[PDB]
Amino acid sequence: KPTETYSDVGGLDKQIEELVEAIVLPMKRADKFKDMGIRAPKGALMYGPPGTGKTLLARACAAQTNATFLKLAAPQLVQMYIGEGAKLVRDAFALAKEKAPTIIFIDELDAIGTKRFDSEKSGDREVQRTMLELLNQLDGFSSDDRVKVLAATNRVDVLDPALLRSGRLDRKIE
Amino acid sequence: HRRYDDQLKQRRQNIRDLEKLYDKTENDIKALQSIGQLIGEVMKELSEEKYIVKASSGPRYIVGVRNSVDRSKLKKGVRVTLDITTLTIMRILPRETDPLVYNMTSFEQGEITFDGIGGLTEQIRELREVIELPLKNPEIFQRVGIKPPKGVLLYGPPGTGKTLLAKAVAATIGANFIFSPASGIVDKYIGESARIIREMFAYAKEHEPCIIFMDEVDAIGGRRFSEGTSADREIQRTLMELLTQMDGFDNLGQTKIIMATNRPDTLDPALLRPGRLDRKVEIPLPNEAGRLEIFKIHTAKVKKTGEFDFEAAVKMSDGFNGADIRNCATEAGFFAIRDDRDHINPDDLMKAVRKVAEVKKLEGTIEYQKL
Numbered sequence: 001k002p003t004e005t006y007s008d009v010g011g012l013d014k015q016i017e018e019l020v021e022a023i024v025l026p027m028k029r030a031d032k033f034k035d036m037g038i039r040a041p042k043g044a045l046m047y048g049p050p051g052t053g054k055t056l057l058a059r060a061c062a063a064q065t066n067a068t069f070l071k072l073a074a075p076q077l078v079q080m081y082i083g084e085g086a087k088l089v090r091d092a093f094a095l096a097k098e099k100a101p102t103i104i105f106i107d108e109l110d111a112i113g114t115k116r117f118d119s120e121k122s123g124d125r126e127v128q129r130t131m132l133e134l135l136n137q138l139d140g141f142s143s144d145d146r147v148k149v150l151a152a153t154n155r156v157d158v159l160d161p162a163l164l165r166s167g168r169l170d171r172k173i174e
Numbered sequence: 175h176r177r178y179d180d181q182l183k184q185r186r187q188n189i190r191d192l193e194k195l196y197d198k199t200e201n202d203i204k205a206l207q208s209i210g211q212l213i214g215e216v217m218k219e220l221s222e223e224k225y226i227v228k229a230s231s232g233p234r235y236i237v238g239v240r241n242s243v244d245r246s247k248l249k250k251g252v253r254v255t256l257d258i259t260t261l262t263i264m265r266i267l268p269r270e271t272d273p274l275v276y277n278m279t280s281f282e283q284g285e286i287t288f289d290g291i292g293g294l295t296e297q298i299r300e301l302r303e304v305i306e307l308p309l310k311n312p313e314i315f316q317r318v319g320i321k322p323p324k325g326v327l328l329y330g331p332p333g334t335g336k337t338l339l340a341k342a343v344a345a346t347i348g349a350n351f352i353f354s355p356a357s358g359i360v361d362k363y364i365g366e367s368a369r370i371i372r373e374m375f376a377y378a379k380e381h382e383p384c385i386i387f388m389d390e391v392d393a394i395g396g397r398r399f400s401e402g403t404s405a406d407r408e409i410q411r412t413l414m415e416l417l418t419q420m421d422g423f424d425n426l427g428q429t430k431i432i433m434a435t436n437r438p439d440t441l442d443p444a445l446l447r448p449g450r451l452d453r454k455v456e457i458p459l460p461n462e463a464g465r466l467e468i469f470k471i472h473t474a475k476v477k478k479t480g481e482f483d484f485e486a487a488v489k490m491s492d493g494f495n496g497a498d499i500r501n502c503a504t505e506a507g508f509f510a511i512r513d514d515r516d517h518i519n520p521d522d523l524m525k526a527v528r529k530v531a532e533v534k535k536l537e538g539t540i541e542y543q544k545l
Contacts, residue, residue, distance in 0.1 A: 021508055029511070036516060037476040038507035039500070082405055083361035090358070117440055122399040125406055129357040132390050136355045139337045141281070161538030162332040162436050166500035172533050 001066055004059040012053060018173040019044065019061050023103060023148050027065060030145070040145035041170035042138065045109075046152045048174065058105060058150050068102045070095060074111035077130035089133035093142050100146045109153035113160035131160065134168075143167050211264055212256035219249060225263070227256055238262040269380065271373050277359075278377065280351035280387070282344055290471050291335060291342045293464035297457055301326070301339075304453055305385070305430055306347060312428070323452045324420060325431040325445075329438050330457035331540050333498030336434050339457075340387050343432075350384040352377075356391040360409060367408040368415040375419055375429070383428035390434060395441035413442060420450035437543045456544065459496045462488055472503040481520040487527050494531040501533065502526045 006016065026033060026040035033040055046054045062069050072092050077085040096102045112131050116123030138147070151169055153159070163169065214227040220236060225248060228234045237256055239245060243266055248254060255265045291298060308315060308322040315322050328336055344351050352374050359370045374386050394413040398406070420426070431451075435441060438454070445451045460468070465488045473482055487502070495501070502523070509522035 025511070032511075032516075033507065035477070036507065036518075039504055041504050080405070081362060082408065086357045086360065117396070120399075121401060122397055124404075125393050125396065125398075125409070126404050128392055129360060132355065132357040132392060135390055136358070156535060159536065161536040164534055164536050165333050166498050166504060167337075170501060170504050170533070172535070 001063045001069065002059050003063065004056060005063055006060050009053060009056060009060060012057060015173060016057060016060075018171060019057060022171055022173075023061055023065060023150065026145060026148070027067075027101060033145070039166075040148070042143055042145065042147070042167050043149040043151055043169040045164070045169045045172040046150065047154060047156050047172075050154050054152050055107075058152060061150075062103055062105075065101075065103065068095075068099045070102055070104045072104060072106055074106055074108050077112055078127055082126075082129075085130040086133050089130055089137055093137045093140075093147060096142065096147050100144070102146065104147065104149040106149060106151050109151045109163070110155065110158055113158075113163065115160075135162065138168050210258050212258050212261075213253065213267065214256050215253045215269075216248060216250045227254060227263070229256065235261050240264065271376050272369070274373075277354060277370075277373075278350075278352055278381070280344060280353045282341075282348075282351065284345045286338050286342050287345050288342055291338060292467040292471065293460045294335075294457060296464075297455060300455060301343070305343065308428075309347065309349070309383070309385075309430070322427040324427055324429070325433060325451040326453040326455060327438065327441075327446075327451055328432065328434040328455050328457060329436070329543060331459065331497055331538065331543075332436060333495070334457050334459070336457055337389075339434070340389070340432065343385070347385070350381055352384075352386045353389060354387065355389045356393050360393065360412070362405060362408055368411040371412065371415040371419060375424070375426075378429045383430070385430040385432060388431065388433040390436065392435060392440045395435075395445065417442070417444055417450065420445075437540070438545075439543070465496070465499065468499050472500055476503060477517055479517045479520060482518075483520055483523055486524065490524055490527040491530060495534060501530050505529050505533075 009016070022041055022044040030040070046058070048054065070092060072088065077088050079085045092104060096104070112127055112134075114123065114127065149169075164172075212229055214229045216225055217228050217234065218226045220226050222245065223239050224236055225239070226234055227237050235256075238260075239248065240263060243254075243263055247266060248263065253267060253269045254263055255267055256262065257264050288298065304323045304326060312322065328339055330336055340351075340353070354370070354374065360367065378384070378386065394409055394416065398410060403410075433441075433451070438446065446454075466485060469484075469487055487499075491502075503526075505526035506518050506523050509525060510516070510518050513519065513522075
């Protein structure tokens with residue numbers, strides 16, 4: 001758990017209540033969702049100008065839950081060794097098995113994704129490999145709504161349109 | 175009199191419990207007395223008592239035979255067991271190329287069935303004819319003279335349940351299923367990238383043809399102009415192995431290849447052309463009648479009120495999503511918490527559908543993936 005709480009921030013409660021409904025309420029209210037059969041949101045999208053408190057607001061919510069936190073950067077998923085980055089996402093949710101109520105954070109969601117087919121250079125493919133892991137792992141044994149991931153990105157302009165689904169990211173928090 | 179006797183009767187039950195522990199502990203030392211055994215496949219037959227078996231590490235040696243094995247099964251193409259000391263054949267094991275079970279087993283737990291994928295019935299009855307029928311009564315295609323289809327392409331816009339299509343078909347047939355993610359098999363090794371594809375088609379004969387599944391492959395289907403490729407040349411031989419397998423002289427057509435992807439164009443145009451992939455099955459946005467069957471699916475196990483909406487939910491969201499309804503089921507639970515109600519308000523269900531219109535903003539309009 002970090003040292004940041006909700007008392008150190010103010011005036012963001014409009015955006016904070018959106019975060020409380022993601023990784024906070026579904027964790028404590030999970031007993032209600034099991035009786036109602038309603039699946040909790042698998043994640044929340046965070047964007048805006050880079051100078052916002054998205055790093056602070058996501059940090060204040062991690063300490064209140066008092067659960068194991070995992071930080072994974074998107075640019076770190078690309079390495080010179082092929083398959084090493086694919087094992088990062090594969091082993092990231094592997095720690096969500098032994099410890100079921102965890103929290104995963106992905107910084108700069110726009111760092112990993114693209115199309116790159118038609119035009120020159122034939123793309124790269126040293127990136128999209130770890131992107132397919134994000135689609136496969138969240139569609140695998142995960143998505144028990146204990147795997148909820150905080151997705152933090154800058155803008156919405158450049159992103160993979162396939163990153164948003166009811167099994168990956170639900171609430172889009174502006 | 176019986177006080178001292180009952181104490182010894184309870185100890186007698188503990189004596190027999192320790193008797194099983196005595197042999198169990200002695201068998202631990204007996205298990206540690208054994209040595210290791212090398213496993214290899216026979217390459218070429220040098221003589222009757224002299225064979226050439228390739229070790230799992232890649233060197234080859236001339237090994238002998240014993241009286242506990244049959245030389246009829248020691249011929250080429252059969253995996254045998256060697257010795258780590260004198261380099262001789264000891265025992266005989268069944269043939270397994272690279273026994274990776276997590277790739278072979280699909281971990282089937284029944285959740286969604288053909289009734290949960292409903293609304294696609296136009297395309298659902300299309301799949302069962304080229305999948306369930308040839309794996310059940312193959313003589314139907316043999317009487318006409320057509321060959322059974324090998325590959326089947328499942329594509330469409332994201333959020334239509336293409337991932338659930340693998341679990342839906344697997345919940346009925348109940349045969350073996352091999353899940354092979356795209357970026358999980360790209361692990362960099364010498365000759366391993368092209369060997370993984372050779373595995374699934376090699377295990378298809380002993381484990382029965384069943385169905386082989388491919389999950390979201392955006393990679394190997396590229397032309398890959400050379401910028402230096404950054405070590406990805408190992409992926410180029412992966413594409414070559416997939417193309418030569420369909421055109422190979424081995425017996426095929428019984429094993430079904432299910433390959434799903436976000437968009438078809440990223441796949442190899444050599445595969446899209448006939449002769450390899452004969453089946454292109456699109457999963458587009460359902461019609462007005464197709465969505466109606468899906469709302470009852472998500473609201474079935476979820477506790478609802480008898481006033482739950484029927485046909486108005488389709489009219490609320492038009493063109494914004496029209497694909498993934500499950501987003502609406504998650505948003506509807508938050509409106510009932512603020513009002514302190516376990517059951518969902520039918521009016522709040524319509525409000526959750528309206529919220530989804532501003533949730534996506536991902537564009538992704540597909541008119542180009544038809545072909």
